Amino acid sequence: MKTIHVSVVTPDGPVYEDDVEMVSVKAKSGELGILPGHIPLVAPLEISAARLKKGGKTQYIAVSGGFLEVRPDKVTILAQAAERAEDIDVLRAKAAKERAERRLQSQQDDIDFKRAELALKRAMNRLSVAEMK
Amino acid sequence: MKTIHVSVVTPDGPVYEDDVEMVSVKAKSGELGILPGHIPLVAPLEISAARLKKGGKTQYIAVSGGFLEVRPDKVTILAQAAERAEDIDVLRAKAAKERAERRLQSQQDDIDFKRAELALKRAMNRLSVAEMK
Numbered sequence: 001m002k003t004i005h006v007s008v009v010t011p012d013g014p015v016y017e018d019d020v021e022m023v024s025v026k027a028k029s030g031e032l033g034i035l036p037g038h039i040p041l042v043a044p045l046e047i048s049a050a051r052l053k054k055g056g057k058t059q060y061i062a063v064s065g066g067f068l069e070v071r072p073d074k075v076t077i078l079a080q081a082a083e084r085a086e087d088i089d090v091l092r093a094k095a096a097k098e099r100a101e102r103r104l105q106s107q108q109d110d111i112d113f114k115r116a117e118l119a120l121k122r123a124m125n126r127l128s129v130a131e132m133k
Numbered sequence: 134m135k136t137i138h139v140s141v142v143t144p145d146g147p148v149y150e151d152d153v154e155m156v157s158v159k160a161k162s163g164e165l166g167i168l169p170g171h172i173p174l175v176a177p178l179e180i181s182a183a184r185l186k187k188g189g190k191t192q193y194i195a196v197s198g199g200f201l202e203v204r205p206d207k208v209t210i211l212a213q214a215a216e217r218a219e220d221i222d223v224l225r226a227k228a229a230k231e232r233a234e235r236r237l238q239s240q241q242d243d244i245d246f247k248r249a250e251l252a253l254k255r256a257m258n259r260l261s262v263a264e265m266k
């Protein structure tokens with residue numbers, strides 16, 4: 001029953017490390033299921049959930065974009081921000097969601113849109129992942 | 134004069150690939166000059182210029198943070214955005230700088246200042262690096 005060593009790193013350092021059966025992530029190209037033996041690969045990740053499977057139990061992590069690196073003996077997710085499901089502050093993410101929506105409807109604006117949309121997506125992603133704890 | 138392979142990749146894909154005598158970058162910890170034989174290292178990068186020294190000649194790349202991944206033989210810069218100095222659209226970056234400055238100067242409510250400050254740093258860095266083409 002083979003496993004892959006996975007590490008999730010943010011600019012603050014490692015947030016998660018384990019040996020798991022499968023790592024599923026959303027790359028810019030599509031959903032990827034990384035199993036032991038996967039060829040080496042470096043792919044950009046979208047604001048999405050990473051799903052880490054170990055003996056049927058699945059651990060969810062909100063990844064606010066970053067990069068996936070797959071090597072023979074390791075899988076690394078390098079994320080601009082990452083939170084395990086159980087560590088997401090749901091109130092804060094709801095507040096963030098509503099703030100982005102308010103900006104996006106601003107009209108009276110020096111409001112930046114592209115970044116306001118990304119702010120909304122990071123909040124919705126965190127809320128979706130938190131539902132899984 | 135030993136070399137290290139350098140790769141710079143962004144969510145659009147590779148920006149640069151070559152063998153250089155040294156790569157210098159601004160990590161969260163401070164400036165790093167990476168020579169061949171450097172031990173493994175993952176470090177987050179600041180909004181900065183990467184200086185790639187080759188045959189006396191130096192190539193500059195504007196890097197909008199992301200991560201540095203070092204092995205004795207090869208250095209990967211995984212950037213949220215990166216532009217070789219000669220590829221920087223100066224008119225664009227100046228407009229971004231002035232747009233961010235207008236946003237920052239606004240005493241109006243939820244403009245979102247943190248990411249306005251980051252937008253300004255990115256434009257200033259690009260304008261500075263373009264000068265090094």
Ligand SMILES: Nc1ncnc2c1ncn2[C@@H]1O[C@H](COP(=O)(O)OP(=O)(O)OP(=O)(O)O)[C@@H](O)[C@H]1O
Nearest residue numbers: 064081082083087088089090092093096119122126
């Ligand atoms: N609601 C959440 N629960 C736990 N930590 C979070 C949450 N939202 C952001 N963080 C953390 O705060 C730091 C900044 O993250 P980021 O810049 O993506 O926040 P943001 O989308 O601007 O949200 P906010 O406006 O709520 O601060 C990162 O360390 C991140 O892991």
Ligand SMILES: Nc1ncnc2c1ncn2[C@@H]1O[C@H](COP(=O)(O)OP(=O)(O)OP(=O)(O)O)[C@@H](O)[C@H]1O
Nearest residue numbers: 197214215216220221222223225226229252255259
């Ligand atoms: N002035 C520049 N010249 C060439 N490409 C650039 C420049 N500014 C951003 N880009 C490119 O556009 C894409 C988005 O980059 P980024 O999100 O950092 O832009 P930005 O800071 O929002 O700037 P702008 O407001 O001008 O779009 C990245 O591919 C990047 O390489």
